């Protein structure tokens, strides 16, 4: 036993599973706004010998020796991270160790707040993220709401936009120490400048969680939250198209008196929260960041916007309603109530024809659809019009099964069962797949 | 642009860095007890298309669709996890999502305790882990000690063993809700049965953090903490030899009255603490777990023990002292004080001849006091097919380095002086360059798990 | 040494001080709304041999023996407490041990909430109490805000009333576990029914802190918060006219399923927070409660309302503005801004002519004036008109010193200094005193 | 209605209750170590017009006007407080507002610690106070243990003294921010100097809660904790013989660098925790403090010690055991186990013959186990002019009661049985009625501080 044997030879069971998954990805239409397809280059770094180095600490300040190279990698991941977002090193620092997006947010909170200090984020069903704070009537759900004290701010249900006015009123009272600007399911640009005014007034930190939109920001096809925020967090996947990992950016040098984010943020990541860094992820992230500086990436990102517009327009033009009436980014939010349907139903139908989207709250009343993934497969505007055509076939199949049944559980039975419904689906699936398989796919060919 | 281009073509700067690192690993003698070399099979899964699936939730209970296959992978990773540790599914469950070892511990604490509830772990300089709780005189260091209230238990410095007697006395007073049995730098077996008695008495949960020893346990070459613990956490690297990731195991079904670990543990992992699982890691872990069920792995684990013994004996034979006098596991703790040196010096010398070990605090020392010891481990080199004679040879090189360090110390005052002398004094440079080159020539000859080039 | 010697004989220094204080009270016009003059009967109990008994625990469940009598006293204080507020013993319980008003509130919070649980009270400068929660921009001030998490609700600055609408909006978000209805400086009735609707909606406890108005409630000259609240706290002084002490009332027996307030409330008082009860205070309180059941007390309380009305009207009729335009209770809030003055100035002038009132926030812009004390000295409506006349003389002296100076520190100098100001004051003082000394005074004659 | 009418006229029901209580106190033998009988002078201040002034804030810094006189009273109460304990105003400050002893402790903790910070006090059944921290296996009991994190230190059951050695060991681990030296049921002097060494080492505040012994300290018949503590709390009753109220003393001026106790302590009292001060109590306290500076008070305090000795000796002489073998203060702890009885039984018998004492837990016993001991104190009867022979006589009556209890125990099984037999069996009733009547006749003869009638 050398540990040099191939996965296909040593673990055929697992290899078959990887191949089934690759085929599923290759044949399907991926419309989850959070997803993307990672470059082969980045995956080669991810599966490298970098997994075998423990490097607790920071470059030049490691617990253990033998880190010359890993130090260079991490410092390079930092530089590339600052370059990708057009940041001055004298004004901004970055931490590249967080294992994912959620860990990065916790590290910020633990670096800057005391337990039980106050935080505000966009309410979850209004399109925020769990990590921004969330509790039901009966219990604390996010760890953020267990260790800290969170109160949500809300959408204006008329405009579908963030009620900035209510935020200011409500934050004058609750007095949060940290306010979070960033979203999971919102189709428009955030008023970073406004949030900053609110934060300046009540003496709070402004954190921007750009996970969804980091690609768009790096490409400069939308305004940057770095003009206005103290701290920025993000995933390295989603629109940045990297491996799964996380980043924390922070202001440094002179504030007025220095900024004091740097030491606290790094200390909270390590030693307070994490163990050994995942150097193979750090390296893949760095590869993804280099890719994001390119003109190619700017084209990709522009195309992301165009394809989301195109998908929006194609849906309007078939009489669907869109929350906020459209989009200024990479996703669209479809209100299936004025079309006599709901996310739960739609999602399950689409799933069965190899189209993957989310139900989303308004049995909830909406659907979220995103462009970044298919765009990465070189989809253009006509291709997305065609996608909508397939979606609409599926909605109309759904609508038909709803008038022919009562409850959600009923609705799902009727689909796997009634042949006239089964065939209409099998036919549609097969067309979707044939259409999808024809487009290219980032990554390795076989796994 | 397809995103199908190779790393050597698209990012030569990064590719050159990978290659420098691979050459470093190939040419060096890796004695850090936490390290291992991961199989090529596992790394292929890690760098797979599984990176591209969001699967928040659990199998059959996902936020989103399109998870048929990922569900099968995760369930398979679970089964293989239970099988690797010889656990009945009716009695034990497992969560395979934690991103690493440290997150796995936090999830347990948040699942089972209220903020500010009480925890005890082995004091850090006595050989515990940060995640078990740690604060200096002046500040809270571990997030475990910020969100929860931690008090350490200690080694008996006379025996170098864990003072179980003092633990019971001290836990009767402090009244912890969770006691943690597991170590980072301890050369002996833990009395899980005893800890359990203490936990039963004061009404605390017993958590076993087997990160260092999980390989040994899976191979059944040492006793299992699953006989005595309620909850078991571990990394998937170290002696399990997987990709970097984490596991939480927990009792389920009937206690006496049911166990209530399952729902709380899974809930704390997700939705409370984590986002999307890292399915590529989950898959690599599963590959590593399959490998750990094999006879080959049992041979490997036995050999790990024998090589640590052999290294121990070779050090005794040259008049070094070992904390607790030896080892019953994969590591040895070497006391360099009686020999007129310290970990800080030794470590830096060894580093400069491509041997990597840790300085380590010796029992009864207030750290600040520069550490009097060195920790050395067998799992990594054993994975490169080292046998007992190879480790005897490793000790020869170590001893050469110690003796060099000894000479530079007689010619120097302070630690800062000592480090510059190694770079500056040319007679010292050469003696080091000579030794380095012999270490490398010796090391490069042994095989290396992974890919050849990166 | 017997310990039977008189205070005048054994401690002349102290006795002189008591006599100076009694003369000050006898000669002055006491307009602080929180104050009253306690009955001689109640003071005799307060200075009794009951100080010499340790009775930790509750009747029949004492740590120590020899408590037959003290048990009877405490049980009697309970019965009289329930009778005074017209409460059914099967529906309400009471705890009579809290050492004062502030301790009673803490005991409720600690009995019913976890540390860091959420509370809302009327903001302090809007006329709430410290114990309801209070923090500045920079620090936690109330212990309530240290051990628990408090967010204030506010007045509508247009109506001078409590913004019930904003409360509901704001409590839907903050999700408090306890909401507190009660005031220190508010001239109107509280919508207990409305607060209850809000509490029912967000699943919170309603606590009513009737400290200011407990006399009025007992007398049934205003609506009772007992119709709507789960828990009621109060001082035993202020309008109840007792010795300094506190009470906690709580619902008991069947809710729908039993109420669980009783055991938690009593346990928090003792053993959790307090030591030995103050049996002499408990006994004085009981004497005061018996007095409050009488027709005499109902007359007194009606007269309190009439005299506050009369004082209001007399102020309107001299062109002062009143927050909320008047009063439905025992106090009035005078806005000295539309009269070109401020509380800080006015208070100090009045003080120097033996009239005691408070500055109150709108250098703040108001003054609070209360009726209960002077009413207890048998003052009637004409007497209060006459009081206002003296007040107005003082305001007009103030106004004159303001146009003749710059800052507050200046203003205070000018008064003790300039003879033409000094004499005008000495003259006024002497008239005030001569007028006041003529009225009777509850208590002992000499101390 | 003037509110000038007498209590006997306006509330005969209440007046009759006061008179029953006064007769009870006059006729009984009060041996509860916490009790005393307050001077008439102090009670006159307590029931004064000072009840009618709101004076939130501090002298010269009041929310409201009209406080010229109350300011003079409070400042005077401060001066007399410092004088009574022989303290330099440049070195010590005092707060005179706390409503009682328990509030004074809470104010100190809230002034100096963060929520969830760590505190150690003498374990409750080892003779500590609730306010020093206390939790059962299953719940937090003291508010001190809810808002803060408390761990007890313990008696050495072999000596009956405080295990200072174990305190140091245990505090090195738990790392408290505040350690509390003071007791409710302890018969000996506390090693303030030792506690201070322990506090200096681990960087904790030393608080002394002298509630039980403040009279003795003021009289200088025992060593002062002010030589060693940073902060001192006390009640104003117990051995100081005042009205029920509380004090907090604190170091001020230069430490080495200034002390920062003053502003925090005063702020926590008000505005953080309390409302309006109880000026009538403040004035009574001041009266009591003046009385405590006198020679008369020193004689009283000396006599307290002698009478406790005398009671101790009289018990030894009749073959009882005393925890720690005797006393150096105002109380004695009697172990009734070797005599074949327990506190629970003894207490109830003594109660029925108008002698009031406490059952009290004996060292090394898990309470639940019905307490094996009795606590007896001298301050109250000494205030009724009892001398040594009078206390010898008290012990005679106690012993008669013990012997009665012994007979009812041989005729009964359980505690519940034992209590009903005392009411029910007529031969037992009479033996008790006889003894009661002799105790009363003996007690009524001694004078009583206070008013005659109420």
Curated annotation (Swiss-Prot), chains A, C:
It catalyses: (6R)-5,10-methylene-5,6,7,8-tetrahydrofolate + glycine + H2O = (6S)-5,6,7,8-tetrahydrofolate + L-serine. Pathway: One-carbon metabolism; tetrahydrofolate interconversion. Changing residue 329 to D: In NEDCASB; uncertain significance. Its cofactor is pyridoxal 5'-phosphate. GO terms for molecular function: amino acid binding; chromatin binding; glycine hydroxymethyltransferase activity; identical protein binding; L-allo-threonine aldolase activity; pyridoxal phosphate binding. The modification N6-succinyllysine is found at residue 238. The keyword Zinc-finger does not apply. Homotetramer; in the presence of bound pyridoxal 5'-phosphate. Homodimer; in the absence of bound pyridoxal 5'-phosphate. Pyridoxal 5'-phosphate binding mediates an important conformation change that is required for tetramerization. Interacts with ABRAXAS2; the interaction is direct. Identified in a complex with ABRAXAS2 and the other subunits of the BRISC complex, at least composed of the ABRAXAS2, BRCC3/BRCC36, BABAM2 and BABAM1/NBA1. Identified in a complex with ABRAXAS2 and IFNAR1. Interacts with KIRREL3. In eukaryotes there are two forms of the enzymes: a cytosolic one and a mitochondrial one. This is Serine hydroxymethyltransferase, mitochondrial. The lineage of its organism: Eukaryota, Metazoa, Chordata, Craniata, Vertebrata. The gene is SHMT2.
UniProtKB/Swiss-Prot annotation, chains B, D:
It comes from the Eukaryota. Gene3D superfamilies: Aspartate Aminotransferase, domain 1, Type I PLP-dependent aspartate aminotransferase-like (Major domain). GO terms for biological process: formate biosynthetic process; glycine biosynthetic process from serine; glycine metabolic process; L-serine biosynthetic process; L-serine metabolic process; one-carbon metabolic process; positive regulation of cell population proliferation; protein homotetramerization. Pfam families: SHMT. Changing residue 61 to R/E: Does not affect succinylation level or hydroxymethyltransferase activity. GO terms for cellular component: BRISC complex; cytoplasm; extracellular exosome; microtubule cytoskeleton; mitochondrial inner membrane; mitochondrial matrix; mitochondrial nucleoid; mitochondrion. InterPro entries: PyrdxlP-dep_Trfase, PyrdxlP-dep_Trfase_major, PyrdxlP-dep_Trfase_small, Ser_HO-MeTrfase, Ser_HO-MeTrfase-like, Ser_HO-MeTrfase_PLP_BS, SHMT-like_dom. GO terms for molecular function: amino acid binding; chromatin binding; glycine hydroxymethyltransferase activity; identical protein binding; L-allo-threonine aldolase activity; pyridoxal phosphate binding. Hydroxymethyltransferase is inhibited by succinylation at Lys-238. The modification N6-(pyridoxal phosphate)lysine is found at residue 238. The modification Phosphoserine is found at residue 420. Succinylation at Lys-238 inhibits the hydroxymethyltransferase activity. Desuccinylation by SIRT5 restores the activity, leading to promote cell proliferation. Pathway: One-carbon metabolism; tetrahydrofolate interconversion. Changing residue 419 to R/E: Does not affect succinylation level or hydroxymethyltransferase activity. Signal peptide: none annotated. The keyword Mitochondrion applies. The keyword Acetylation applies. Its cofactor is pyridoxal 5'-phosphate. The modification N6-succinyllysine is found at residue 238. The modification N6-acetyllysine is found at residues 61, 139, 154, 255, 306, 414, 419, 424. Catalyzes the cleavage of serine to glycine accompanied with the production of 5,10-methylenetetrahydrofolate, an essential intermediate for purine biosynthesis. Serine provides the major source of folate one-carbon in cells by catalyzing the transfer of one carbon from serine to tetrahydrofolate. Contributes to the de novo mitochondrial thymidylate biosynthesis pathway via its role in glycine and tetrahydrofolate metabolism: thymidylate biosynthesis is required to prevent uracil accumulation in mtDNA. It is linked to Neurodevelopmental disorder with cardiomyopathy, spasticity, and brain abnormalities: An autosomal recessive neurodevelopmental disorder characterized by global developmental delay, moderate to severe intellectual disability, spastic paraparesis, ataxia, and/or peripheral neuropathy. Patients also exhibit dysmorphic features and congenital microcephaly. Most affected individuals develop progressive hypertrophic cardiomyopathy in childhood or have cardiac developmental anomalies. In eukaryotes there are two forms of the enzymes: a cytosolic one and a mitochondrial one. HAMAP family: SHMT (MF_00051). It comes from Homo sapiens (Human).
């Amino acid at each position: 036993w050398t540990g040099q044997e191939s996965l296909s030879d040593s673990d055929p069971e697992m290899w078959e599973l990887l191949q089934r998954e690759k085929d599923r990805q290759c044949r399907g239409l991926e419309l989850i706004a959070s997803e993307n397809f990672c470059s082969r280059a980045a995956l080669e770094a991810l599966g490298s010998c970098l997994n075998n180095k423990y490097s607790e600490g920071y470059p030049g300040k490691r617990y253990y020796g033998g880190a010359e190279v890993v130090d260079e990698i991490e410092l390079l991941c930092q530089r590339r991270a600052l370059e990708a977002f057009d940041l001055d090193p004298a004004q901004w620092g970055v931490n590249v160790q967080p294992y994912s997006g959620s860990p990065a947010n916790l590290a910020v909170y633990t670096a800057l707040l005391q337990p039980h200090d106050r935080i505000m984020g966009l309410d979850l069903p209004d399109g925020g993220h769990l990590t921004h704070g969330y509790m039901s009537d009966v219990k604390r759900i996010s760890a953020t709401s267990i260790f800290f004290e969170s109160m949500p701010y809300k959408l204006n249900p008329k405009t579908g936009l963030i009620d900035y006015n209510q935020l200011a009123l409500t934050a004058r009272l609750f007095r949060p120490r940290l306010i979070i600007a960033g979203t999971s399911a919102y189709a428009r640009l955030i008023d970073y400048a406004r949030m900053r005014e609110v934060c300046d007034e009540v003496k709070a930190h402004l954190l921007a969680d750009m996970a969804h939109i980091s690609g768009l920001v790096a490409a400069k096809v939308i305004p940057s939250p770095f003009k206005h925020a103290d701290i920025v967090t993000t995933t390295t996947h989603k629109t940045l198209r990297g491996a799964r990992s996380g980043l924390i950016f922070y202001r440094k040098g002179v504030k007025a008196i220095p900024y004091t984010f740097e030491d606290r943020i790094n200390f909270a990541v390590f030693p307070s929260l994490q163990g050994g860094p995942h150097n193979h992820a750090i390296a893949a992230v760095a590869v993804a960041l280099k890719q994001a500086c390119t003109p190619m990436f700017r084209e990709y990102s522009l195309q992301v916007l165009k394809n989301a517009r195109a998908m929006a327009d194609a849906l309007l033009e078939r009489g669907y309603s869109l929350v906020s009436g459209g989009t200024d980014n990479h996703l669209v939010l479809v209100d299936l109530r004025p079309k006599g349907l709901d996310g739960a139903r739609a999602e399950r139908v689409l799933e069965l024809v190899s189209i993957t989207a989310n139900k989303n709250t308004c049995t909830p009343g909406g659907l979220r659809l995103g462009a970044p993934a298919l765009t990465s497969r070189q989809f253009r505007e006509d291709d997305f019009r065609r996608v909508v055509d397939f979606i609409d076939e599926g909605v109309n199949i759904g609508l038909e099964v709803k008038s022919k049944t009562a409850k959600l559980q009923d609705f799902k039975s009727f689909l796997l069962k009634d042949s006239e419904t089964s065939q209409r689906l099998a036919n549609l699936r097969q067309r979707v797949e044939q259409f999808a398989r024809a487009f290219p796919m980032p990554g390795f060919d076989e796994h």
